[PDB]
């Protein structure tokens, strides 16, 4: 056989969290016969069960590694490669290291228009953010972002959390007219839309059962004429409101 003296390469992450997996991948060449030779991979007292490749007088062996809250510090990963009563062996640090997540506290997850809303991260004084909440923000995401320094390697960790607004069901004048004039068989758009979260329920209703063909384009009949109730509900509310259609002669 032979085994040339000079360490195996050796690739690995120089930092590594707790309850996180890793990959460790040991290699070297110009070796014979390389079938034969045994691998010997391990962190700290845990042994690593490598996937060991072939090739031209060749090797690499890859192993994924886990970690646990025992393991915190300072560990030793070696790599070592064995071929008859001779081994090259390579010696490297890996640090593990335990980041708690920042996380987002919302003194109410799901609020209405108008509350004050605060913002602080859990895991010198004390800082929170204060906004007056607004249905713009229905759906928005706050962070914490936290760094970490370990083994002179900056590490960082986050965390989002959305923020539910509701706004009470409304029909402005603007987004939903009280009358119309439309001359008998010309082409409109009955126009009226609810505003809310949640998306209020609308119903323009004439004589309680004739509906108002709102949103689509119609061509004007006589059928239309009348006077309609456009009720807007939802969870937070109800807005009622009065549409009148007056249909002109031809
Ligand atoms: C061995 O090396 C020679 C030169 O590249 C090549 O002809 C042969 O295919 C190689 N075998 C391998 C890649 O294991
Ligand atoms: C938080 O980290 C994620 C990676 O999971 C990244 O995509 C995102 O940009 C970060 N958010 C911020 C800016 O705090
Ligand atoms: C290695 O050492 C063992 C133990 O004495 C010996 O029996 C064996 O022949 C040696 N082989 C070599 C030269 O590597």
């Known amino acids: 056989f032979v085994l040339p003296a000079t360490p195996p390469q050796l690739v690995s992450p120089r930092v590594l969290e707790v309850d996180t ?6 290699s070297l060449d110009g070796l014979f016969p390389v079938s ?5 991979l391990a962190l ?14 060749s090797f690499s062996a ?3 590694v886990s970690v646990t809250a025992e393991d915190e510090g300072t560990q030793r990963l070696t790599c070592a490669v064995i071929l008859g009563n001779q081994s090259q062996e390579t010696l490297q640090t890996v640090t593990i290291y335990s980041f708690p997540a920042p996380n987002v506290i919302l003194t109410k997850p799901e609020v209405s228009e108008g ?11 004390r800082a929170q953010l204060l906004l007056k909440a607004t249905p713009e923000d ?18 960082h960790k986050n965390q989002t959390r959305e923020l539910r607004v509701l706004y009470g069901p409304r029909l402005d004048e603007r987004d939903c007219p009280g009358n119309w004039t439309w001359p008998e068989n010309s082409q409109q758009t009955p126009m009226c839309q609810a505003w809310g979260n949640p ?24 059928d239309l004429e009348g006077t309609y109730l456009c009720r807007a509900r939802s969870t937070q509310g109800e ?7 007056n249909v002109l002669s031809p």
Do not use: M, W
Request: proline content about 6%.
């Open 115 to 125: 509350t004050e809303v605060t913002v602080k991260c859990e895991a010198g004084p």
């Open 239 to 245: 807005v009622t409101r009065e549409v009148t259609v």
């Open 36 to 40: 034969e030779a045994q691998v010997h």
């Open 199 to 222: 998306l209020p329920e609308l119903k323009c209703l004439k004589d309680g059962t004739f509906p108002l063909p709102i949103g689509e384009s119609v061509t004007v009949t006589r």
């Open 138 to 155: 229905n759906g928005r995401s706050f962070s914490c972002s936290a760094t970490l320094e370990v083994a002179g390697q900056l590490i």
């Open 62 to 64: 890859k192993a994924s």
């Open 21 to 26: 997996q890793g990959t460790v991948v040991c």
């Open 44 to 57: 700290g007292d845990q042994r690593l069960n490598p996937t060991v490749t072939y090739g031209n007088d």
